Design a binder for this molecule. Structure first.
Ligand SMILES: [Cl-]
Ligand SMILES: [Cl-]
Lengths: 578, 578
């Protein structure tokens, strides 16, 4: 499914705005913005911590002239289970809170009249949705009848609601359903190879440069476009060409356009190559999180975040720990930021080797089935973005378990089959010698928190422990390694010398000592600090109103270590043969 | 001009989203969200502090089926001077940064094809725009050639950009252009009297209650709708009826709907009556201000703000110091919050009696002309909102000057002529015996900061000074009095005992002592604390990154005094015969 875009042949109507909202088995509505998480909008603590079904409702008018058009209703994201009703008719259901879903609804609309859309969203986690969790009953001596808790083991808050825009769009009855683009370098040219999915068959395809000059054209539902003297897309030079696809049939006419970038990505030895040059990742793990709206899409915050990425000198980030909005990937295309996009397989770990995760009752064949469908949906959505340069299949799963090996072999095999054009990783906090899964990926991503979660407060252990660990990863697997997470919680304004945990000084010193180690290791091709910004988590005595490891505050202002990273990364080239 | 609303006969296309953006005489664009202020979006300090013209650009497609429709392009707000181009054609110009403007553009569009909209916005202040300011050249021994400053004397930052949504909407060629509604109480019924502006003449008008029951109907371009057993709108009971207007002609058909509220407002003696009951204002001066987006409209923030208003027990606010977005007034209608809406005549004061403001060179006949046009635009926009219950013509002008008397007599006279159905005020910080203007309004609004700006730190003077002052206002003018501003800057987390300026304790103690005085004065009908939330100002040694007098932080979380006000206001009735 293609991102909804207006053209000569397609209308788009955005239903974002103020909706009516209620919780299960309640008749009274309140007002609720869309897109947004509902948790922080009100002062009702029982809604903040609500677990169950909520219902959104809105009126909309369909123009009579949309008859004899396809009418699609698209929901960008709703966490985690959703059902969509048009005038009381169920038009689609969806499982998974971080990818879009849509249905054709012309059969159910009142033309030239009022219509009602209702969207049910259920935030109840189970062990066969990603990320997983479990609702548990607690009726003991200290809890009243009916006390229940939603348990989950990922470290970000279970925000719920409609997190990305709801839109209605039209197409002709015979229309461009999808297309695939692959770019190759050939002699002094680039090739853009394409295939179009449609019931139609007569297509003209045109490629235009930045100045609207036509640089290539082809008649054909599949084909190759040759670009002589191409300008390649890469961090530091985000050149985009505009691909125009025109269906020209007897009764149907359809146009779809997308900006694409010409680049190659390849792993060879201990090098991560973009356009055949050795890349060095400088960046962050991020989160879709901001004040008040929770996980809701906000283009103000998105553009602010990319300007901060360019300001600090980052060239990349990982979409920890789930696919982000398409909007963020289009921006990464424009700004020239390399993206590792990650499936929502986070929380597959009970920090305890006595509780097994990959076992009947928890992560099983049903979870695997969902994970495989997720990879198919994710690659289908994002396969044409130049900014996505790697897929991450999971974050900190219990990869030391025997059952994790067969599980992830299947996930990894399916991902590569779906997209052979990008490398694959998995983000590990398991010990190097214990993971049964990292031997199957292209690039190793390791999260390490020496002197924070272990030997807390003792910065002196970092060089000893980190160098020994990373050398063992390389000795066992002989793959490029990204230090995919490291950092320390810092309360803005907490200062100390000597540095103490939770101060800005400790965060900067820890990060500084980690990267001094990486500079001595020629097989380390990247550093991603956790996290870009402070974000909300569930409440616990270990979380000082959320996770405070941001390099920026939640309102997008820098802590001390942001300036250290700006100075370091201004000296580090994007392409660096270590 | 009516708020753009979809119906059976009208389409609305929202152009908000990501636009291209550049500054004057520069050819390279960056990305910029709309709606938003541009100042805090980037890390370019020279754009943050930019003074001059900026240019927004976006492509849009017009459906061929919009031929033979009116096509209107509406800009919700752009601060402060703006020009709108459709495919290079100037379709309208506008002066004033806080009210909407529109043009019919069907003559300039390419049907079924790409179109380009460009919007120029100029943030350069002058003495004949509201709020006023002046660009000054400073080429002396300590400033290089070309150093210039924009001087202005209002205490909020001169954020600029497109602050409210840009939309395109259709109507039939003969259409409902405007309508006026007035509500009266008669015996046991309410009357909704209406007049419609249109080139058409055959109208059916229907009024529906909350459950869609038809409670009144009338055929006629003007008329009266009788509601037996009306449910009145008021704070604490925001009942809205839906007014449906249907134009039924030979070749044209048009429907427009609006929720309205049935209430009366009247000043009599020292009482402010809503629905013939004595009201007591409990609330705030607000600002259109939030993190990152500046003055840009954000419905997440708006709904959050109204939930906080209901949580703390407020029943009212003033739109300090300019008209707010229509969106906020529709929400105030839904939530039952009484609004004093204020014209942007703030900054008409050089805190210095040697520099006259109402004089040739500063506030003169050109400024007055703009002010009068502003009142006409403001009442035309908001005349049908039940939540607006009073107009404020200015905030803290230099009303002690001889020239201020003739200026404001004309403003006040024109406001009353335009809308005889709502009382009029002006918000004063002049001394009671010195203002030449308050004798002409219906309700006195006085801002007082004893122990903050005067006798700084000495809370012991409050009762002595405030009671004497307010008794003199009543003795001179014999009108109801609202304490329209009072408060203290408080940094969140700054605490002290004994209380010190800038601590949360000092803010709470000051506010507590002020309202203890008000409770002893039967002619005081309201308390508005300055401010609802921390907001940005220009930089100065008196502003600790903006104005810190918020009862809530800028991210909408409560300070200590928020809990004091919640407890007080939970005990104070909305209707209180003092
Ligand atoms: Cl962490
Ligand atoms: Cl102030």
């Amino acid at each position: 499914m293609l991102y909804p875009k207006e053209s000569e042949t397609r209308e788009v109507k955005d239903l974002s705005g103020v909706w009516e909202f209620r919780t299960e088995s309640d008749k009274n509505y309140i007002l609720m913005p869309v897109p947004a998480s509902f948790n922080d909008i009100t002062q009702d603590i029982n809604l903040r911590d609500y677990v169950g079904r909520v219902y959104y409702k809105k009126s909309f008018f369909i123009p009579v002239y949309w008859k004899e058009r396809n009418i699609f209703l698209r929901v960008g994201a709703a966490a985690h289970f959703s059902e969509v009703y048009v005038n009381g008719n169920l038009v689609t259901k969806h499982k998974g809170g971080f990818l879009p879903f849509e249905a054709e609804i012309s059969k159910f609309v009142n033309y030239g009249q009022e219509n009602i859309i209702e969207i049910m969203v259920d935030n109840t986690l189970t062990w066969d949705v990603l990320p997983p969790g479990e609702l548990k009953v607690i009726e003991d001596e200290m809890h009243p009848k009916g006390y229940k808790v939603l348990n989950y083991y990922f470290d970000f808050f279970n925000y719920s609601g409609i997190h990305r825009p709801v839109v209605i769009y039209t197409t002709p009855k015979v229309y461009i359903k999808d297309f695939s683009v692959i770019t190759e370098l050939s002699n002094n040219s680039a090739l853009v190879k394409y295939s179009i999915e449609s019931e139609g068959n007569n297509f003209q395809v045109i490629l235009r440069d930045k100045d609207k000059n036509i640089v290539a054209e082809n008649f054909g539902k599949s084909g190759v476009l040759e670009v002589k003297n191409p300008k390649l897309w890469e961090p530091g030079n985000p050149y985009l060409y505009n691909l125009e696809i025109k269906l020209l049939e007897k009764d149907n006419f359809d146009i779809y356009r997308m900006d694409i970038g010409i680049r190659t990505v390849r792993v060879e030895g201990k090098q991560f190559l973009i356009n055949e040059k050795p890349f060095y990742f400088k960046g962050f793990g991020k989160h879709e999180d901001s004040d008040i709206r929770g996980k809701g899409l906000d283009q103000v915050i998105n553009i602010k975040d990319f300007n901060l990425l360019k300001w600090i000198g980052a060239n990349s980030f990982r979409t920890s720990h789930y696919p982000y909005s398409e909007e963020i990937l289009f921006l990464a295309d424009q700004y020239g930021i390399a993206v590792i996009e990650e499936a929502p397989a986070v929380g597959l770990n009970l920090w305890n080797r006595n509780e097994k995760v990959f076992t009947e009752g928890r992560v099983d064949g049903k979870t695997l089935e969902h994970h495989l469908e997720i990879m198919r949906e994710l690659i289908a959505r994002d396969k044409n973005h130049p900014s996505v340069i790697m897929w991450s299949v999971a974050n900190e799963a219990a990869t030391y378990e025997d059952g994790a090996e067969e599980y992830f072999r299947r996930v990894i095999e399916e991902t590569r089959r779906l997209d052979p054009t990008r490398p694959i990783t998995i983000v590990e906090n398991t010990k190097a010698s214990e993971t049964k899964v990292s031997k199957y990926v292209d690039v190793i991503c390791v999260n390490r928190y020496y002197s924070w979660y272990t030997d807390s407060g003792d910065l002196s252990v970092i060089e000893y422990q980190l160098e020994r660990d990373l050398r063992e990863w390389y000795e066992l697997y002989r793959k490029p390694i990204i230090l995919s997470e490291f950092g320390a919680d810092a309360i803005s304004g907490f200062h100390s010398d000597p540095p103490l945990m939770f101060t800005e000084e400790y965060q900067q010193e820890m990060i500084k000592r980690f990267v001094g180690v990486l500079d001595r290791l020629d097989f380390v091709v990247g550093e991603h600090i956790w996290n870009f910004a402070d974000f909300m988590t569930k409440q616990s005595i270990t979380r000082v109103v959320g996770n405070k490891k941001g390099v920026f505050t939640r309102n997008r202002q820098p802590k001390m270590v942001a300036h250290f990273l700006k100075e370091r990364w201004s000296k580090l080239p994007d392409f660096w043969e270590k």
